[PDB]
Amino acid sequence: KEYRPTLAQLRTFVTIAECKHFGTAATKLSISQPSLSQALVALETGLGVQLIERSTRKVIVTPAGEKLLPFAKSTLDAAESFLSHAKNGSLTGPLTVGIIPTAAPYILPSMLSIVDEEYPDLEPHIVEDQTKHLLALLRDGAIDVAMMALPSEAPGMKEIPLYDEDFIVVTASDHPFAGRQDLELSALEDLDLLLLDDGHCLHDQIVDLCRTAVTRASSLTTVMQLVVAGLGSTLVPISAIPWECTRPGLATANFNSDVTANRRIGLVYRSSSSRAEEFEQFALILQRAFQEAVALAASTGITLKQNVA
Amino acid sequence: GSHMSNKEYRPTLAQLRTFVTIAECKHFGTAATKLSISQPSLSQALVALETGLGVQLIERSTRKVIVTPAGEKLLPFAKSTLDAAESFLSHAKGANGSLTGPLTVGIIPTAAPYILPSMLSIVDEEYPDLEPHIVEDQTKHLLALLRDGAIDVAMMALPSEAPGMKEIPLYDEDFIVVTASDHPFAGRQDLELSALEDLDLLLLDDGHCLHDQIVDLCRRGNINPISSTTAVTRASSLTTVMQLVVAGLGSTLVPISAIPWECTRPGLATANFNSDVTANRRIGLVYRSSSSRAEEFEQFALILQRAFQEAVALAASTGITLKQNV
Amino acid sequence: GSHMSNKEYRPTLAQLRTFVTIAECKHFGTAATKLSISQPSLSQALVALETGLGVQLIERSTRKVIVTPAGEKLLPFAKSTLDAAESFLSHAKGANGSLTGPLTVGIIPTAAPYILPSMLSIVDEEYPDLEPHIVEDQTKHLLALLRDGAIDVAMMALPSEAPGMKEIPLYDEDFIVVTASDHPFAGRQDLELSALEDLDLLLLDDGHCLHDQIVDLCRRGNINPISSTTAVTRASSLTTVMQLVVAGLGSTLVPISAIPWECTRPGLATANFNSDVTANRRIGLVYRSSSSRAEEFEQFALILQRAFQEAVALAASTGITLKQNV
Amino acid sequence: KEYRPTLAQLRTFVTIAECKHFGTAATKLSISQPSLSQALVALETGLGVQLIERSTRKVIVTPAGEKLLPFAKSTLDAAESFLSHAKNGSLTGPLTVGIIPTAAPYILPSMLSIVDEEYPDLEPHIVEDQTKHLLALLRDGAIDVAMMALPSEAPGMKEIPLYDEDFIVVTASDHPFAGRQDLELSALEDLDLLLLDDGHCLHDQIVDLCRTAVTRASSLTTVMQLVVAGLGSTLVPISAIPWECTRPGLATANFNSDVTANRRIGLVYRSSSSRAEEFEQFALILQRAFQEAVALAASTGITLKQNVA
Ligand code: NA
Ligand code: NA
Ligand code: NI
Ligand code: NI
């Protein structure tokens, strides 16, 4: 035959060999004495090896059996180990998170601190990269969830909204809009805007736009350099204010209440995942992290955008 | 949720084999073909496993399979369960007794001397109809001979990276550090990879694999990341190196099987890397994939494993302190 | 011997060019063709050099040329002599003034912010008819744009390993180590490669090349030998990394040009590797080999070199201690 | 033109720029004042740049010249550096030596010690490998010289003989030839010889031969293992006696005076090399190293082969 032993057969062998009685062994395995015998005989017939000698009062392991016993035992130990590691509505184990570059720096320390202090069994793994790369990794299973601007517009993905994050206007210190808090969308025409692909959504009740020597930057650092040097102005998410907007050479302004200038940040994951509940719990952490970043921005004394509604 | 872990459930080997195959193939079609079962029954077995455990192991899309993080964590445990079962079966063919006739074995020079007496003794006593022929030579020569049929099997460091071959893993063999008696690291048992800078290591092409959790000096991408800073650019023999170590012109790494023969003479001391450092080699048996003698070679592998275990106990019996691992 | 060194002899650049070409080509035929001279006159020039010096540089066989050990030792010195002469000529075309019209430049994110203001200032003041267009993005994007003609030149870490490109080397840029204020290595200026184990380095794909005389962690054979032991598997931005460093969750490497902008805020300290450690990157200009604008690009390279020199002086003026090299 | 400046032209420029007079400059360069002028004008015409202004009493470097001066100066410094590093019937600088595996271990420490103490400017580099590999490296210039058994029989190579090295017979302790010093070549038929490809040459006046489970070994260690275990006997070069033949489980024997059992060790190098004199000087070191190894062998108290002639 092309016989392969089963774990139940191996369990019968190991138990008999250690108990040295059929009665004791069958009771320890919660099976009948005929079934115990059947499984042993199936094993000995499959192998072509007598493992156990049976007498009236006692059982003896053959020399062939003593040689094979440690190997059967390691097989059962590994199976028990598999089961033990396979062991409930909570954030535990590995969680691999993609985060876009214009969000990551400003919330990552809060998020990691909260996980370390309050979710001690969670094992977070963070990948920071551009939206398109994050979605490719998500699709291929190299990350579990991606924190990014919504809508994702990615097939087969589900979205959990986290928060709306306002932008602030950042100019050179000497720019005539320095300190203004009532700008209209028309004010855009008077700035040499260098914008990043950061999910910004700009509109008011009439105009919808939610649709320099440097053609395009991928980093806010390149942009801020140009702004300090007087060659441009830009939009910065408010979470980045403490880190990016407090150095000399910069000033800030804001649009009026009637202008929307924000981005919708969300968690995106594969529809095929069973982990929706874990991701929702993780969302709560990210919302807190953002609120901590917002309070840090407010504590700089820089005036933040005011909104209606 | 109310569809979590099933208490009386125990996974079967067939269920574990379905899991491992899907996880490695990443398609249901190629997995079912490899297991010679239907695509519905593959699915049935996997769902039985996932329902028993209360854990999603695989995510299913139209074109694609993805192993979940829970699945990746459990994959090595399923694999060890199957490996132990295959090991049991392999040792149960001690009755089969297929090791007869001529067997020509290539063995690398930093392994052969230290396991050859055990292996030949075991063959002579327990496999009296086996007719062993041993060729001891450098890796490249052994592979040319293997390729051309002049040897049947080669015992060497894995990966072999040889076209047309199969590999049977035998064992991981640690190295010990060997210095001159006067070297400042003599006697240390907690050396880190940084110790390389002050060891003056003269290394052989002996399969050594050195790394810790942060730095990898192994992955031999056709360029050796450890350089020598000594008058000896390149040594091909351990005896040349040990002579240089006794003379105070460097230190080296020696396989633990070689300790009784090489590391007990005057002028030498030994040291070891710490638990967190890997400093070992993967020894394997390599043969031509077309061979009808796979089962004989697997039986021969078991003999080599015993021979190595005997060499390790001989090393231990010298009283020299060996590498500890986690 | 009585056919040793000639006292009044001075080597000429043409003689040195004959030597370097033969040494690299290893045939007289391909060397003479590359220099557009006859095979006899190539030989004549080499023999004039060897007779002047009293040193055999090349051994001649029928099929083969071999550079002598004396020759291998002198080869980098001949090469630096020719490079300096080419540099002189390249700077003498400051009068030529070929940098006009549109020039679209790709620059990697860990270089662009720190040299962009200098470069644009120099262009605006001294090359008023040049019309620069800057694209700042990750290496792979820049190379796709370069390949497709959407940019003319890319400023990036060498080697580029991009098909169809030429490279102009610009400069080697050292890194500085950046830690949290409380890190035990804060302030050190003598760190060895072993310090990696206790730094918790979060590294970017920024061209960093780390090695000393014994260990090479650079040679990126499509597999990163330094691993991270942190919650952050992979960061693509320096700002993410610096935030993590301030928060005490790791250390990093920062190009020295970025010191004024990135390394002067509270919560950070700096350190450096010792003289014997290399921790730098080779920055170069990469362009399509078919281009008729090679001379314009070489002139643009000189501007970038000045911009970098200005960024290094800005870094120096902060009072932060920079890496020393041998 | 496709003009390239010459070093002489650059030297004229740098000298004038530093001296600030044509007379002083021409004298410092040991050339005529017309020749100095000619070289400068050739440089300025080739470049299309005036580097020097000439007045009656004085010379002034133009702004274009001041900019170019450091580059000319580095060109001349590099040329002077080349010449300085290019600088006599002695063993100095790099010497890359191939040595066969059955010779290397037993002479390498003496040789390196002698070089380090007595030839402080020599920079030795040692490659130890099999004869065929050494010859491939020699041919390709990756080594300068190979220490090996003669004849090499390699095309285009020259040989320097170093010494004849005797072999000793090594058996298991219990072998009936233990301690014998008068063996004939016929004694070979009574040993299960495992021999290495080590250049051994065996003959007497009548028979010329100079022409186990282990089919073949490349290492003496594999062979000695088999000899201690009683499965073979072998031949060992006398230089290896202290290291290889003093452990328990071994005994030694020798052939009689009328038997030759030796190997001719030599240095082999490419005919195309000009370094014969250096190699001859290196040969003297190797001869001493071998004589030290021979005295070490003798000091073990093991009886060495006696020869006629
Ligand atoms: Na994990
Ligand atoms: Na050298
Ligand atoms: Ni991309
Ligand atoms: Ni070979």
PDB file of C-alpha atoms in Angstrom, chain C residues 51 132 185:
ATOM      1  CA  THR C  51      61.613  52.832 -19.915  1.00  0.00           C
ATOM      2  CA  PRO C 132      15.040  74.823 -15.061  1.00  0.00           C
ATOM      3  CA  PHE C 185      25.483  56.926  21.754  1.00  0.00           C
TER       4      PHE C 185
END
